[PDB]
UniProtKB/TrEMBL annotation, chains A, B:
Listed name of the protein: Ubiquitin-domain-containing protein
Chain ranges passing through the membrane: none
Length: 222, 222
């Protein structure tokens, strides 16, 4: 899933260690951030005094940070469904999205796509205009945007741009439009704009769990 | 500095809240992550029982996460010095780097750039081959890579690629070479590969502070 190697690199880089050293050298900074949180502001002076020792221990072995980054990577996986009858293009787009950290499913079957989306509930749909067996990405897109359960699912249409402007003005329109021939990396960036990029989503979950842990300990012990 | 707007978007997104809901629904997963950390494994059942309540409180108002992300943004700035005599090019590259979140300084004075780097200790140097007053980026790069204090400062040379191959084989070589005319955006990503991207660095600091806080509280109370 998410590609955290560079982020793991940062955690071990000299610069990260020096920057955290600097940030915690004057405790006014951290005391202020701590005191912004009503639930943490009663943290006593003994605990604040252990902030620098605990960071030093943390950097000699940052299992705490690595533990939570791993949790986030595991739950920060977002899923993209590609509805595209051009198998070769669908496979190329899947590997690029997978190469960015996304989980990707694929289907040739325009007619079954709407109910498949309902069943599997992907985080984003890449939907080609020109599909097999007389199905059409514009038609499929109109069905999804008319459905109250599925209308908030982001759809990126890929296809001949001839019809984009007119389809965009419809009340049931796609969330984005990407012209064919599609350059996979551009598509990757558009998916990351609509939903998260996997590494940022993983760090957000890692931080959320770390905060929840600190708040739960505080709640019981202050 | 760092541009957190997408990251702040994620934290307020419905998907992030649902993913966090799912993650804490079965506490086996969270218990395992907690128990990986010797300093946290003795967290009592009362505190573990407050994990979902505190998370719910977190999502009603995520001041904890916001205050840590803001701390990280404030200390996640990394500084790039551009040594380039072409003022128009230096300005364009600076604004592209600043647009991605880096702090950027500029100079046309190659003669004094070595000592300026020593004084200011930037995290990365963009160094043009062709400079004014008979200075040369290859020569400057050789001075820096022979200096024990500054030889670990990453240098991205920009210029005529004619001399890249030969300079690369020298013992005092640059860390990266980018041909002129420079595509600013790819220069940006080369800087992000050598040092962090600012948003990832900021999230790393935010997670580090969160973990240090949780570990210090735990150290004092269990």
């Amino acid at each position: 899933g998410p590609h955290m190697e560079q982020l793991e690199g940062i955690m071990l880089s000299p610069a990260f260690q020096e920057q955290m050293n600097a940030l915690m050298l004057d405790p006014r900074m951290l005391d202020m951030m701590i005191d912004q949180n009503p639930q943490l502001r009663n943290m006593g002076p003994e605990a604040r005094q252990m902030l620098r020792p605990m960071f030093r221990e943390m950097m000699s072995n940052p299992e705490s940070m690595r533990s939570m980054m791993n949790m986030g990577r595991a739950w920060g996986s977002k899923k993209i469904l590609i509805v595209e009858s051009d198998t070769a293009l669908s496979a190329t787009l899947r590997s690029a999205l997978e190469g960015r950290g996304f989980t990707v499913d694929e289907t040739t079957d325009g007619k079954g796509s709407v109910e498949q989306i309902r069943r599997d509930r992907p985080d984003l749909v890449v939907l080609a205009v020109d599909l097999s067996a007389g199905q059409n990405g514009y038609l499929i897109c109109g069905k999804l945007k008319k459905d109250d359960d599925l209308k908030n699912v982001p759809i990126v249409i890929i296809g001949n741009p001839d019809g984009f402007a007119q389809h965009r003005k419809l009340k049931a329109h796609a969330d984005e439009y990407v012209a064919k021939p599609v350059d996979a990396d551009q598509l990757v960036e558009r998916a990351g704009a609509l939903i998260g990029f996997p590494e940022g989503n993983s760090m957000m979950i890692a931080l959320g769990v770390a905060c929840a842990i600190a708040l739960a300990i505080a709640a019981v012990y202050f």
